[PDB]
Swiss-Prot record:
Family per similarity comment: Belongs to the intercrine beta (chemokine CC) family.
GO cellular component: extracellular space
GO annotation (BP), single: regulation of cell shape
Post-translational modification: N-glycosylated.
Gene Ontology MF terms in the entry: CCR chemokine receptor binding; CCR3 chemokine receptor binding; chemokine activity; receptor ligand activity
Listed name of the protein: C-C motif chemokine 24
Organism: Homo sapiens (Human)
Tissue: Activated monocytes and activated T lymphocytes.
Function: Chemotactic for resting T-lymphocytes, and eosinophils. Has lower chemotactic activity for neutrophils but none for monocytes and activated lymphocytes. Is a strong suppressor of colony formation by a multipotential hematopoietic progenitor cell line. Binds to CCR3.
Length: 73
């Protein structure tokens, strides 16, 4: 899937447990006041994650090898 360019209202109080998160949704827009990523839990939740944190980049790092099916090589 691919998120369009939505936004958020607040930043997660902290990171998330990889055992609960499933995938994020980057939302870089100018009409908004700030820019961050949106993560979601496997239970059906959705929290906005900040890129300044390493759990967004970390998840986003492993998520890139899954979603973006580059190649088997």
């Amino acid at each position: 899937v691919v998120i369009p360019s939505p936004c958020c209202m607040f930043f997660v109080s902290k990171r998330i447990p990889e055992n609960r998160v499933v995938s994020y949704q980057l939302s870089s827009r100018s009409t908004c006041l700030k820019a961050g990523v949106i993560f979601t839990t496997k239970k059906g939740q959705q929290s906005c994650g900040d890129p300044k944190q390493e759990w967004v980049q970390r998840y986003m790092k492993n998520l890139d090898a899954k979603q973006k099916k580059a190649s088997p090589r």
